[PDB]
C-alpha cells in the first residue's frame, strides 16, 4: 500500500496470508469469507506468461496478522489447503478477465477477536454501494513504494470509486463488465494505491443500512503504483457471484 | 459462505460489536453522501 | 500484477 497507514489491531478480522511454503515468503493477499473458504485472486495462482503455477501443497494460509514477518504466537492461525479452484473462464492470456479463485481449507478455522470473516454483497447492496466516488478500503502488506522498503504491520487506504469511460480512457487494455478502477484523479490532491503484494486482497464497503462490511472487490491489476493519472483495477465480485454460490454448494463448505 | 458474506458476517469483534469506531469509517459513510 | 521472515515452528509443515 502506497500513502497508507498503520491498520489498528483487529481492524480486519478477514485478511489473510497467502504464504509460500518454501521459500517461505509471502505471495498474495486473499480474505476469510467462511470457516472453511478463502478468496483470492486467481493469478495469484496460476499465471503461465511466468510459469506461475502454485498447488494445493505448495502454499501456507496466515489469518489473524498483523505483524508482517514475526510469527505471532498464540494469536495468529496456519491453514492447510484442502482444494483449489479458479475460473474456468479467467482470461489470463489477454487482461485477467474474471480474475478469481476460490480455496477450501484442511480443517475449518475458529473465530476469535482477530479472526472474523467478511460478507458477500447482493444484487441490492451492490447496486446502492456500486457508486462512482464512493469510498471502499483497501489492506495488505505489500510494497509501500512503486520502485526502491517494505511494511512492519497491516497498512491500509481508502479509495474512491471512478466512472467507466475514465478508467477505459485510463489505458490501453481492453476492459469488461467484470471489473471496475478506483482511486484518485490528479486534481484531488490526495493519492493513495496497492501495489506489489496486495493482491489477491479484499476491498470493501461497509454499509450503511445494517452496518456490515462487504467485499466488493479483489485487488486485481494495475500499472505501477500510485501513478499520477492511473487507477487500480478490481475483480467485479457480485458479477461472479453466481460461480462462487456453485462451488461452495456443489463442494461442501 | 454465500450471498450476504456470512450470519455473524461483516460485524468485528473489536468494533461493531462493542460499538467503537475506528479511526477511519467516517470518511467512508461520509462519502455516501451521507452514511447512517 | 502491477506491470527475512521469522522462522515458522515445522510442527506446521505437514
Ligand atoms: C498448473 O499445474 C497443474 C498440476 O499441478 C496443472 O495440471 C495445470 O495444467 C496447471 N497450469 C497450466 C500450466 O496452465
Given at each position: 500500500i502506497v500513502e497508507g497507514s498503520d491498520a489498528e489491531i483487529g481492524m480486519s478480522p478477514w485478511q489473510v496470508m497467502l504464504f509460500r511454503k518454501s521459500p517461505q515468503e509471502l505471495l498474495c493477499g486473499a480474505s476469510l469469507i467462511s470457516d472453511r473458504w478463502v478468496l483470492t485472486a486467481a493469478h495469484c495462482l496460476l499465471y503461465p506468461p511466468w510459469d506461475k503455477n502454485f498447488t494445493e501443497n505448495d502454499l501456507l494460509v496466515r489469518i489473524g496478522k498483523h505483524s508482517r514477518t514475526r510469527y505471532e504466537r498464540n494469536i495468529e492461525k496456519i491453514s492447510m489447503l484442502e482444494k483449489i479452484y479458479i475460473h474456468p473462464r479467467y482470461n489470463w492470456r489477454e487482461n485477467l478477465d474474471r480474475d478469481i479463485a476460490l480455496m477450501k481449507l484442511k480443517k475449518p478455522v475458529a473465530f476469535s477477536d482477530y479472526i472474523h470473516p467478511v460478507c458477500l454483497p447482493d444484487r441490492e447492496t451492490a447496486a446502492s454501494l456500486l457508486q462512482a466516488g464512493y469510498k471502499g478500503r483497501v489492506t495488505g502488506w505489500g510494497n509501500l513504494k512503486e520502485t526502491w522498503g517494505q511494511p512492519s504491520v497491516l497498512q491500509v487506504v481508502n479509495l474512491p470509486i471512478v466512472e467507466r469511460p475514465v478508467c477505459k480512457d485510463?489505458?490501453?487494455?481492453?476492459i469488461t463488465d467484470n471489473m471496475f478502477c478506483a482511486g484518485y484523479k490528479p486534481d484531488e490532491g490526495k493519492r493513495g494505491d496497492a501495489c506489489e503484494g496486495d493482491s489477491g486482497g479484499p476491498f470493501v464497503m461497509?454499509?450503511?443500512?445494517?452496518?456490515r462490511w462487504y467485499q466488493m472487490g479483489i485487488v486485481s491489476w494495475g500499472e505501477g503504483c500510485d501513478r499520477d493519472g492511473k487507477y487500480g483495477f478490481y475483480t467485479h465480485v457480485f458479477r461472479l457471484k453466481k460461480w462462487i454460490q456453485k462451488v461452495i454448494d456443489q463442494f461442501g463448505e | 459462505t454465500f450471498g450476504s458474506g456470512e450470519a455473524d458476517c461483516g460485524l468485528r469483534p473489536l468494533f461493531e460489536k462493542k460499538s467503537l469506531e475506528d479511526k477511519t469509517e467516517?470518511?467512508?459513510?461520509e462519502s455516501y453522501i451521507d452514511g447512517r | 500484477x502491477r506491470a527475512d521472515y521469522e522462522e515458522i515452528p515445522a510442527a506446521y509443515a505437514x
Open positions: 485510463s489505458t490501453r487494455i481492453r461497509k454499509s450503511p443500512f445494517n452496518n | 467516517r470518511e467512508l459513510l | -
